[PDB]
Design a protein around this nucleic acid. Sequence first.
RNA 1: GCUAGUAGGUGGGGUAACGGCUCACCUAGGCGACGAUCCCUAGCUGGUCUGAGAGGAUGACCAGCCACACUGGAACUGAGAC
RNA 2: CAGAAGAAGCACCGGCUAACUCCGUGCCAGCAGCCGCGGUAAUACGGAGGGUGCAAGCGUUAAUCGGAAUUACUGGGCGUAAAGCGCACGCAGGCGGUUUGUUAAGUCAGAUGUGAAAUCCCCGGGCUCAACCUGGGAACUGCAUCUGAUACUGGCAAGCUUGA
Lengths: 158, 205, 79, 81, 129, 123
Amino acid sequence: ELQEKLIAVNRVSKTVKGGRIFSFTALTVVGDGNGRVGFGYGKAREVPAAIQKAMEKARRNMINVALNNGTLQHPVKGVHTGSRVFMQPASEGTGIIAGGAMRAVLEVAGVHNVLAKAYGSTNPINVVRATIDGLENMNSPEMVAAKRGKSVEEILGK
Amino acid sequence: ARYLGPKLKLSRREGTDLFLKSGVRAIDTKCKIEQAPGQHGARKPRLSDYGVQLREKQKVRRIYGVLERQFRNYYKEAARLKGNTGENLLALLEGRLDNVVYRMGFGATRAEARQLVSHKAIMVNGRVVNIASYQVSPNDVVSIREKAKKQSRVKAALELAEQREKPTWLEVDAGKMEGTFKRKPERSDLSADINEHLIVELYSK
Amino acid sequence: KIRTLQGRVVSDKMEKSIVVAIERFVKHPIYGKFIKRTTKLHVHDENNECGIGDVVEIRECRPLSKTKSWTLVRVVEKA
Amino acid sequence: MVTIRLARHGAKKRPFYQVVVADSRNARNGRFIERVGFFNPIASEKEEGTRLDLDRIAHWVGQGATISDRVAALIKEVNKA
Amino acid sequence: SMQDPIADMLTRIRNGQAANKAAVTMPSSKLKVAIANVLKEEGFIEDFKVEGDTKPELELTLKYFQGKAVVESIQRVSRPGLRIYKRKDELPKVMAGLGIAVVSTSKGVMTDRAARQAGLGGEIICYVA
Amino acid sequence: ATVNQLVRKPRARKVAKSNVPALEACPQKRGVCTRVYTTTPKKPNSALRKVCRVRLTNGFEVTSYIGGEGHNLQEHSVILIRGGRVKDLPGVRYHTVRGALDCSGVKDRKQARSKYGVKRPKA
RNA sequence: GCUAGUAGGUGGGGUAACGGCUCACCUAGGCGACGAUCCCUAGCUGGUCUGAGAGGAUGACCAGCCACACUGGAACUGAGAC
RNA sequence: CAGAAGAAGCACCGGCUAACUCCGUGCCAGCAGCCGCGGUAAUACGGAGGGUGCAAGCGUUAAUCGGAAUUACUGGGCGUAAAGCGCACGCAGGCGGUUUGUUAAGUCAGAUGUGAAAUCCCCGGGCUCAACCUGGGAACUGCAUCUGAUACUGGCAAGCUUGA
Ligand SMILES: [K+]
Ligand SMILES: [K+]
Ligand SMILES: [K+]
Ligand SMILES: [K+]
Ligand SMILES: [K+]
Ligand SMILES: [K+]
Ligand SMILES: [K+]
Ligand SMILES: [K+]
Ligand SMILES: [K+]
Ligand SMILES: [K+]
Ligand SMILES: [K+]
Ligand SMILES: [K+]
Ligand SMILES: [K+]
Ligand SMILES: [K+]
Ligand SMILES: [Mg+2]
Ligand SMILES: [Mg+2]
Ligand SMILES: [Mg+2]
Ligand SMILES: [Mg+2]
Ligand SMILES: [Mg+2]
Ligand SMILES: [Mg+2]
Ligand SMILES: [Mg+2]
Ligand SMILES: [Mg+2]
Ligand SMILES: [Mg+2]
Ligand SMILES: [Mg+2]
Ligand SMILES: [Mg+2]
Ligand SMILES: [Mg+2]
Ligand SMILES: [Mg+2]
Ligand SMILES: [Mg+2]
Ligand SMILES: [Mg+2]
Ligand SMILES: [Mg+2]
Ligand SMILES: [Mg+2]
Ligand SMILES: [Mg+2]
Ligand SMILES: [Mg+2]
Ligand SMILES: [Mg+2]
Ligand SMILES: [Mg+2]
């Protein structure tokens, strides 16, 4: 039911009196392929434990995205820390034209066609955060009409 | 300009049957299909995303017998043509004369259909065509030449063809050894084990 | 009708001649900002009516000297 | 003088002439005043092998343009439909 | 010194929405009133009124839907340092048509869709989304 | 920068200098070896790398690496050089083309033969 | 900072033709930080390569325009050439 | 007509980057675009077996754009990463509160002329296919002129008081 993807595993270190203690971090995303997506970040002495923790957090941190037939509603910009991302809808058959970190998020969320670009820092943790922020801030015609007190036809008419 | 090596190694690398043999036997009884070729073939291949895209593209290429320059040209044409690029690419591949002959059943394999086309045994709308990459238009008629109607391999291919699923976009008469290309096959009429969006993404890398 | 320019007299010290500055308002090709440009023309001024600062009116004609190919029509405004 | 002639285009062994009006001094495939038609000598059956703007040709002839022999033959064939 | 009252009006709207103000008040002008009319017609603001004779004051009543400001973003486009004019065939689309662009045409201030229907270009005053 | 400032002084592109100036934008250049010798690499590497000081047909005098195991180059040998820096060798910006002019190929080479000018063995 | 035929005017001459094109006289002007003058490089365009675009780079082949013809200079003939 | 008969190579395989083992060597010989590799159990040097990618080509070098939002118009920055003149006054320049009228320069609309052909793109046609050739269109985002629109910017005239 839920598609899970491991985006990056990194080895970090802290120094103690006897020397360096290594550990691992895992960044993952989960999604239902129908507008729900979440990301998890886990730390452990071992890679499988870190990955399991990340999946556990991702399953709990899901948000909702208003998709339009497997594409975005409109161009969106997202930002987190040094990472800036830009995404726009594309015609059917275009595919996911995006870098790896954005691609995992978009694919588990269920975006099938999109043109994307990452500016600034391409650190995967912050790129994932910026991508999810843009998707969560995307608007749909229903929301726009409701908030403006108009009808969907008046929003998208002549 | 044509792959001339062992055929089952390609299917073993791609992890599936590519219909590179006639089908009189089983791919499992002819080869270790579940195992990749070579000394290290038993290893579990961890594939990156680029590896997955590349393997999908190579699978389609090996199925249709097309080399890289021609396939890239096909992709460029598919992107240029209106509509869904992956579906356009699949339609362009299915429009090839050798593939049309194989689907009509005059060749046991696509390689055999290609040899039949090359050796001037195939006619399109009453003219001899020996170009394997010739594009077959709708309402076109593909027929076996009269001097080649006596070949036993054509009859063997015809009796092997009905053992498989009949293409619904063609209309074949085996008595006269001739068929009509009624229309371009839709995406539904093609195999569901082909992910053309992987190829489309690969050619954007 | 006849194509015609309008400008401001910046010099009149020549005999029967004046220098007229014509201002154009054009969009910068790269940055899109509308900027002012100036072209200076030598104009034939018979009777030496024009003075420095007057807003004058000019048209194109045959060459009259090395640098003169324009001639004065009327004085729109006098300084 | 002004003349109406054929400029050879197309490919090797497969010529395709453009019927053009030109100052006769210019090179055969060079500067021309106005294109008035075309002539394909290897045109297949059911394909238009010759097309001429007879109104423009007559206008230029009235203005004083001469006509090459091949273009005159083409005009005769076109008029003899 | 003050050199763009329109950008000032837009900023007052933006900051008031951010501060959850019921209404925002500013010195009035005919262009500001025309822009306010477009905003009200499109439903981005609730109402507006002009009070006073010698020093007219424009008040705009802001709206909130579910605890969130209706004006998600409002941005000056043409500005004194750089004027922006667009022809009818190149009128911008805001948020893939979900937002509006306020355009000053020879037939008055209207949205980009209205200018497209009238077949007119003009000056792109601002984007609202 | 504001648009006024850019109108006054436009953005300036930085010119990039070539890392192979002695080639003068040619794919190769012919030279005559004035010296053939060995040299030691920069740390953390250690070896006796084979180089030659060569005077080119355009008058440039440069140092060129001699790749491959063993070579037949000496003073007055006429060689062809191509672009390519040797990271651990200080100021060696060019590579000798093995198998061109007086430079022979590498003996008993079976893999990557075209990179060292070795003909296909008759096997 | 540059310019004395230099900028303009009158008259004569000259050209197929307007014109400091040339000559005599008079006026003291003309160009220039919206870059004159000087120095370095360069045939120009339709186009070509790249790029999502905006741009960046480029001007071989084909076609339009220009310039040159061992080097420097000159005219003759001619509808047209220096 | 005859007979599979006359017709396959090149680069790569530690990561980026698709593809792994043995033997030889032992900071040597050597590799290398970068990270780096080589010190006696080297998937990085050299050979072999196996494999990967292209294929009558394959690699290398040179050179341009890209990736480079790394000159940022679209589309960047300046407390501490590079970056606010030591502080001012002020010419040129850029910018300009509010109302009415007028003008129509900017701006907008339409039309006309031009924007050579070829090239690019779309729909077709002919070479067995394709490259290639070719019909028509679209485009040439520009310039000029004419006729209109007057909200906004500019000019002109008259004001107003909230900036000064
Ligand atoms: K790390
Ligand atoms: K397509
Ligand atoms: K004169
Ligand atoms: K070392
Ligand atoms: K002179
Ligand atoms: K004179
Ligand atoms: K004179
Ligand atoms: K371009
Ligand atoms: K250009
Ligand atoms: K000369
Ligand atoms: K050993
Ligand atoms: K900027
Ligand atoms: K106007
Ligand atoms: K006005
Ligand atoms: Mg080929
Ligand atoms: Mg003159
Ligand atoms: Mg030169
Ligand atoms: Mg770019
Ligand atoms: Mg040239
Ligand atoms: Mg000579
Ligand atoms: Mg004469
Ligand atoms: Mg000459
Ligand atoms: Mg790999
Ligand atoms: Mg070993
Ligand atoms: Mg090796
Ligand atoms: Mg750039
Ligand atoms: Mg920066
Ligand atoms: Mg410091
Ligand atoms: Mg600092
Ligand atoms: Mg200070
Ligand atoms: Mg001050
Ligand atoms: Mg004002
Ligand atoms: Mg054209
Ligand atoms: Mg047209
Ligand atoms: Mg006004």
